[PDB]
Subunit: 405 residues, 3 copies
């Protein structure tokens, strides 16, 4: 009876998890599409490799730090190596564990596209290990450490922080880590001219980026729907809202991009779609389809503004607009929780939207400070023992080097 509902809940969570695994393929296509053709091999391989690393690091330590027994709402201290997962009374056990593993893989893979084309291999693999072992799961404990282990909470959740599926926990966290990495690696050699103007580099396979967007969008259905952690009538609502945020983000982008540039530029249209997906991840279980449309519209435009600001004003070179999609998109969705969520979902102690907005903002700032700041430190310390970039000669020839024999 209850045992049959538990079985259905396993089925859905594990199916959703598999859909989220398939986002790993999404990111691989998207990033390869956005890349210069001479680097397509390296970027395909980094994306496969990071999935290997993230799985093992999250199995060994990440899950425990994130969801194990809480030390002061700060960090988890058991469930390393999935120790005694099956003894926990939390009904979803391995299904929950795998679901959260593929979340961690999502957070970590954001990196590769932000430092593509000129970073070396070691910064990628070591970056992956670091985000998955430290940055991601400790923030995750703060935000979500109430979810698995009995009778505990993370300090941010205790204050009333809301992030349904990880706009901040996955996407902003990964995006700010990527942003530090992009800064410390530096721009691609021919990105900026001596007058400060920006060149368009890459996007040599628009069809492949398009296929990437579809895979990502499909996967986000599991990302969002699976985050219910159970099957109810609500499942159709969450997925419909996810779809509507993506679609509205795209349409707002088509309009804004035509009006302001007199053509449809593929790069910015994708950015906007994916940013809307990221944004709706914060709130898709607690908003109406019309609010999902509004969140998409607002996120689509703001993400494109951000993408241009990052590129041309901050002069951070982000070949896939990862910082705009995941970092900024997650901030926007996370803040929108306060504006749009059904009032019964608010956790702010006084019950108000104003107060929830301040808690959401606090979560946003803490996520930035933790992930960008530790990421800066991590890449500063790495740079001291291994150069972060490849040589300029390698950069012009292409990272696809070894397959020439």
């Amino acid at each position: 009876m209850e045992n049959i509902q538990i079985n259905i809940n396993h089925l859905w969570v594990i199916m959703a998890a598999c859909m989220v695994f398939l986002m790993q393929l999404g990111f691989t296509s998207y990033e390869t599409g956005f890349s210069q053709s001479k680097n397509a091999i390296s970027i395909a391989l980094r994306n496969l490799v990071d999935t290997l690393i993230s799985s093992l690091v999250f199995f060994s330590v990440g899950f425990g730090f994130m969801f194990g027994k809480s030390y002061m709402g700060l960090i988890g201290i058991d469930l390393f190596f999935a120790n005694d997962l099956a003894l926990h009374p939390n009904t979803l056990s391995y299904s929950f564990f795998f679901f959260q593993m593929v979340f961690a893989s999502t957070a970590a893979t954001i990196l590769t596209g932000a430092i593509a084309e000129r970073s070396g291999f070691i910064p990628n693999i070591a970056g992956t290990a670091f985000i998955v072992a430290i940055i991601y799961p400790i923030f995750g404990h703060w935000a979500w450490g109430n979810l698995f282990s009995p009778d505990q909470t993370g300090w941010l959740k205790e204050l009333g922080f809301i992030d349904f599926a990880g706009a901040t926990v996955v996407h902003s966290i990964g995006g700010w880590f990527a942003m530090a990495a992009a800064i410390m690696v530096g721009p691609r050699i021919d990105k900026y001219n001596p007058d400060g103007s920006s060149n368009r580099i890459g996007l040599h396979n628009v069809p492949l980026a398009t296929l990437g967007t579809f895979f990502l969008w499909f996967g986000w259905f599991g990302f969002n729907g699976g985050s219910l952690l159970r099957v109810s009538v609500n499942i159709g609502l969450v997925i419909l809202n996810t779809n509507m945020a993506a679609a509205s983000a795209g349409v707002s982008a088509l309009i804004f991009i035509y009006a302001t540039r007199k053509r449809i530029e593929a790069g910015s249209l994708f950015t906007a779609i994916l940013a809307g997906l990221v944004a709706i991840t914060a709130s898709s279980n607690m908003v109406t389809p019309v609010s999902a449309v509004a969140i998409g519209l607002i996120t689509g435009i703001l993400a494109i503004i951000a993408e241009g600001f990052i590129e041309k004003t901050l002069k951070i070179d982000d070949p896939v607009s990862a910082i705009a999609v995941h970092g900024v998109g997650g901030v926007i969705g996370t803040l929108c929780v306060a504006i749009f969520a059904q009032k019964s979902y608010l956790l702010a102690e006084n019950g108000s939207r104003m107060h929830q907005l301040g808690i959401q903002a606090l979560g946003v700032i803490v996520a930035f400070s933790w992930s960008f700041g530790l990421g800066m430190l991590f890449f500063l310390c790495l740079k001291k023992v291994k150069r972060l970039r490849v040589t300029p000669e390698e950069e012009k020839r292409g990272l696809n080097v070894a397959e020439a024999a």
Copy 2:
């Protein structure tokens, strides 16, 4: 008890819907594969864009026209913007809504491949909006307007019209709209020679079209299985029949194409596979696996004959054979309902196959007259304010223009 079965039914419908969403990627690959390499960008982008448009138009008006409260079995008059979806006693609510949205996206995206390579952007996006707002959901009301809202029916269904998953409602409707659009746009510039002979243009990425076929076939599992709208033992039957129709269609094609052309031509083999899929969509819940095999065999050959007739006798230039796959394939499947369906499924008032055949034929003719005729009018009226084709220079250079900076 019943509440647990309702939960399982949501789970399946929403999973199926997500599989059908992934057909959008299928069509993108298939069409890009069938295209000339110089146009691959435009076709990838049109396919993504139409998904944005179809989602929002169907959310706003299409669903209401199709499934809302019936005015005389002719058109629905509420459930615009999903108004009060949750209050309906129809148990599937949002899940049903999203399922039917991705059906609408399927119907609309058929267009792009039929007018690829020489139509301009506006005819595509405006065509999408028109099919999704008017043609598709009003015919859908006629055929399926009994399905969601309590105690009503569409006039065609009232006469006993059967289409399980949309051989006519999705595929023929979309295919006849595409056929009007292909006619009004006209053929590609170098398609036909001065002696009337046909050139083979495009299909520059057979591997990508192959991947497209697999995605489509996979998605059709959800398209058909999900149309049960509930989980039963019948789910394996529907999917097995879908598979067997595709496989038989392909084998019949391999045989017929070898016998008549002394080589395996990839284009026609794909046409046949997809046409068999389209055909089995009418009846996969009501036939045996052996009848699914017969439907596939018959559809495979007839679709290839049709594809050649359309191309070389009607001189309609259809770069992906959309009219043959979706238009003709849907007619064949829809007629086969009368021939092959289990007698308990027939709705013809007198209970007979002859009479069901006449009702199926009537549905077929009405679908044609409505979708081809309104499509002709729509593109005639559009042409009066915006030329439907690009300039010949643009056509020879390739629609992939803006990505050259």
Copy 3:
């Protein structure tokens, strides 16, 4: 109650089956990626065609031979054409049938990559028909003929042979058939030099092989999870173990390949990942996640050693390392059942690991003798009436010939 659990069990098995269908696309991408660009068309088409053939042959005879009423634990003798499937009391009927069909398609498609680039069409299609009609389903009866039809068993299962999801039944069987075919076709013309050294041929689309690996890995979730044939809490365990075997196989490979070749070679990294997947298929329901990690680590390295042995010592030319992934990987996983499986799962009559190891080894040797030996005979007899290879001129020009008009 029990009827609702039966419905959930259908849902999962059919979903898993659809995921396994999508492996067909996986193999198509993987093999196309590993191929020389001039042959990509032929390999895409062979992979689509084999899915057509395997479906129909397995529907007609394979399923009956494999799962029908047992004649002496040797071969099944009913359920041809799915005759009376619905009357069987085995609760999963069509769902089970389709699940096992896509297993058969997996076994058969292994062939194409092993003889790619220089075999002709007929050896491929006839090979497919033969493996699906004879080799696969008769061995399948021996190993699994207890599973569907009431009160019977296959002789190997009777001795206590264990293969959860088909490390031997699918993968080794298909891999040894492929190995015979590769031998009888002979090596690609420029594979080996006059001094016996090996050239690297192909792998012209590493990104596409990467996408192939992800699809395969995703599909293996269904392959393994679906093999529970029911939904329980165990579903998360099986999928988590599948993931962990792949990830460990990849990491072990990164380490071993760096240490021994001072670079990451993409081909061997993929080989190892897929071999780990194959291996964990034998035991994913009966091992802990840490043992899945050990199985992956061991399989990853041994598969790479094997791949080199096959190529450079046996001088069998296997363009996708199918023999190493599927043949050797399946042997390793099948033997590991005895080493790692939870003791309650062992079937060896005396209850011991030593004894189970001897039964697993016996299954391994019988699978080899049957599939390699009949495959040798089959291709010897075929060669007598149709040459197995294309002409050297065709081989240098590329099998992609007919699409040039």
